[PDB]
Design a protein around this ligand. Structure first.
Ligand SMILES: CCCCCCCCCCCCCCCC(=O)N[C@H](CC(=O)[O-])C[N+](C)(C)C
Ligand SMILES: CCCCCCCCO[C@@H]1O[C@H](CO)[C@@H](O)[C@H](O)[C@H]1O
Length: 627
């Protein structure tokens, strides 16, 4: 059948009974805030910030917190941060490219010849559409974190839990140490896009649409991938339609319309209204409503740097950046998912990504020797046509100029530390994640001699409408340990360094456990500020503190995903003088793919990361450190 899974537990079985996102006690939030400021602030700065926190906790902060709690109890169907967080993305006026949109790239199909572009584009497309059908049938297994898959991720448990009503289901899982996650975002995976508007962009879905959108050389093509009965279109016909697009001989358009999706959101909002004025709404709706956007690039990947640039931004002509996601397939079959961030999070995109990798590699729809159907693709595939005014053409030229200028400022590079990973570190009773994070702290100290604002994403999807909380890796412990290794390594014994690392790891583990339970401080302080602003009040003095601004200017922005389907991933820095650090700790090795703008140096940072990882592993093996 057209399904990639056959869950007996309905996909959405736990949704109704998910726990609500906790609101921390304000006293906890202020303590945690200060704990994270301790490594960043001089004594005088910290004392000023400390006084502000005291007045906030007993003053206007107490009052905003009471209101936040009252509001949350009138809105038990959601989380206190969901509205504010959708706003953070959707009110943002800057380009979604680089600032927000990440990518994850697939490993190759293990079978060499299945990496043919036509073959793999067909197979990946069909798997993605199989995913859509599986979700819609309620046949996709619910997303569940298991503390022990051996006990709870079993047919025995599945057999019973399917009889527990959704009002009670979450508790059945909880009782077996299993934690169903929110899946509300899955409704925006397909047939969905972000529409530029004044003030705040709009999330559009049209679940009735049956067509795929394909970009090749900046030309837009659409064809049905679901028939009138809801069945997947013959994969041989899909293959034929993709071959038809690959065969087209038209050069890149004079004014590639896709550039517009990389613009400032007010500029793009105006230009889209003008497209509508000029009679393009029907065409735009075909773009907006397609199941997803498939992008066919006509060049192979030169190396991982080329891959990163290609999947993170491309050349401006061949990505519809607004779409829920773009599935990119290069000439050498290298594929990736590039996604718009407002609707979704790593956890949900990864589930899709993982199921599509599994299905396209283990049960490919077509082979490299399949013969395309003899189908009238000239009729079945529509090449979209936009009516562009003089203003639209000027807009596209200005969109390209801005795009090209920004991309020029961006560098990306990677390391693959081969000496060890999870296996070695777990044997040393350390958190692998903490160790990578320590390395980044230590590397930044070695390169720049500073301790800076650092962000690590953590999923709160265990809660209703949960997205993320911020882990703050830059701690008193990491600062102390980085100082020891970098500035006075002769001053500490190998045992003392090991203790310093144990402490780092413990504290990181504590921060991680807390953030996952909604017990970070960032989202809570964020919501309180949002609430003051929404109620028409002046910004509280806590938020005018330069220390608050500095804490939220994340020079080191980090995120990790763990998957055998992932070759690499990436995102640009979140501030001009930042690094965007995508990393993974594997059993045997640690990879980082780091982005930077002109004001930082990613190549030097990565050389520093490598050295720090060498020092860390040396000390853990009891070897005196190489200086
Ligand atoms: C050569 C080895 C390289 C391996 C890289 C591992 C892949 C990691 C890819 C992560 C890309 C981002 C995926 C999820 C998006 C995400 O984490 N968004 C974060 C969302 C949030 O709310 O924190 C934002 N930010 C990236 C800026 C921290
Ligand atoms: C077979 C699966 C076992 C289901 C056990 C149901 C337990 C749900 O009981 C729950 O207890 C909570 C604390 O008192 C309350 O917040 C909820 O209102 C209540 O429904």
């Amino acid at each position: 059948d057209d399904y990639l899974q056959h869950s007996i537990v309905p996909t959405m079985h736990y949704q109704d009974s998910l726990p609500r996102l906790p609101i921390p006690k304000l006293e906890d939030t202020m303590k945690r805030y200060l704990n994270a400021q301790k490594p960043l602030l001089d004594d005088s700065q910290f004392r000023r910030t400390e006084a502000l926190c005291k007045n906030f906790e007993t003053g206007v902060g107490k009052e905003l917190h009471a209101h936040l709690l009252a509001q949350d109890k009138q809105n038990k169907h959601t989380s206190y941060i969901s509205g504010p967080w959708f706003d953070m993305y959707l009110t943002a006026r800057d380009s979604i490219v680089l600032n927000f949109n990440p990518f994850m790239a697939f490993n190759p199909d293990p079978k060499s010849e299945y990496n043919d572009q036509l073959t793999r584009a067909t197979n990946l497309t069909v798997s993605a559409v199989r995913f859509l059908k599986t979700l819609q049938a309620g046949l996709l297994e619910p997303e569940v974190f298991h503390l022990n898959p051996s006990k709870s991720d079993t047919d025995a448990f599945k057999r019973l839990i399917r009889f527990v009503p959704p009002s009670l289901s979450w508790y059945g899982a909880y009782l077996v140490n299993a934690y169903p996650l929110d899946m509300s975002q899955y409704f925006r995976l397909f047939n969905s896009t972000r529409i530029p508007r004044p003030n705040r962009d709009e999330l559009f879905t049209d679940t009735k649409a049956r067509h795929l959108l394909v970009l090749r050389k900046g030309h837009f093509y659409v064809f049905d991938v679901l028939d009138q009965d809801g069945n997947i279109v013959n994969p041989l016909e899909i293959q034929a339609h993709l071959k038809y697009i690959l065969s087209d001989s038209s050069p890149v358009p004079e004014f590639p319309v896709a550039y517009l999706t990389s613009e400032n959101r007010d500029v793009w909002a105006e230009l889209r209204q003008k497209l509508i004025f000029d009679g393009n709404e029907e065409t735009l709706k075909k773009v907006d409503s397609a199941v997803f956007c498939l992008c066919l690039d006509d060049f192979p990947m030169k190396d991982l740097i080329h891959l990163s640039h290609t999947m993170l931004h491309g050349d401006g002509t061949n990505r519809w950046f607004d779409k829920s996601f773009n599935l990119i397939v290069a000439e050498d079959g290298t594929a990736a998912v590039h996604f718009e961030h407002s609707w979704g999070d790593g956890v949900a995109v990864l589930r899709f990504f993982n199921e599509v990798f599994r299905d396209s590699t283990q049960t490919p729809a077509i082979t490299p020797q399949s013969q395309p159907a003899a189908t009238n693709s000239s009729a079945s595939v529509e090449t979209l046509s936009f009516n562009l005014s003089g203003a639209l053409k000027a807009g596209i030229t200005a969109a390209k100029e801005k795009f090209d200028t920004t991309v020029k400022t961006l560098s990306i590079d990677s390391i693959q530390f081969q000496r060890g990973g999870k296996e070695f570190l777990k044997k040393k009773q350390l958190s692998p994640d903490a160790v990578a994070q320590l390395a980044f702290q230590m590397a930044f100290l070695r390169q720049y001699g500073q301790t800076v604002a650092t962000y690590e994403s953590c999923s709160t999807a265990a809660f209703k409408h949960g997205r993320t909380e911020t882990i703050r890796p830059a701690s008193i412990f990491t600062k102390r340990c980085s100082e020891a290794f970098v500035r006075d390594p002769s001053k500490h014994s190998v045992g003392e360094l090991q203790h310093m690392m144990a402490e780092c790891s413990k504290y990181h583990g504590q921060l991680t456990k807390e953030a996952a339970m909604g017990q970070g401080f960032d989202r809570h302080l964020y919501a309180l500020r949002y609430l003051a602003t929404a109620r028409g009040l002046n910004l509280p003095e806590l938020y005018l503190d330069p220390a608050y601004q500095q804490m939220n200017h994340n020079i080191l922005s980090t995120s990790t995903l763990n998957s055998p389907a992932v070759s690499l991933g990436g995102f640009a820095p979140v501030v001009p003088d930042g690094f965007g650090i995508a990393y993974a700790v594997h059993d045997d090795w640690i990879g980082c793919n780091v982005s930077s703008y002109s004001g930082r140096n990613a190549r030097e940072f990565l050389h520093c990361v490598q050295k720090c990882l060498e020092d860390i592993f040396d000390a853990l093996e009891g070897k005196a450190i190489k200086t």
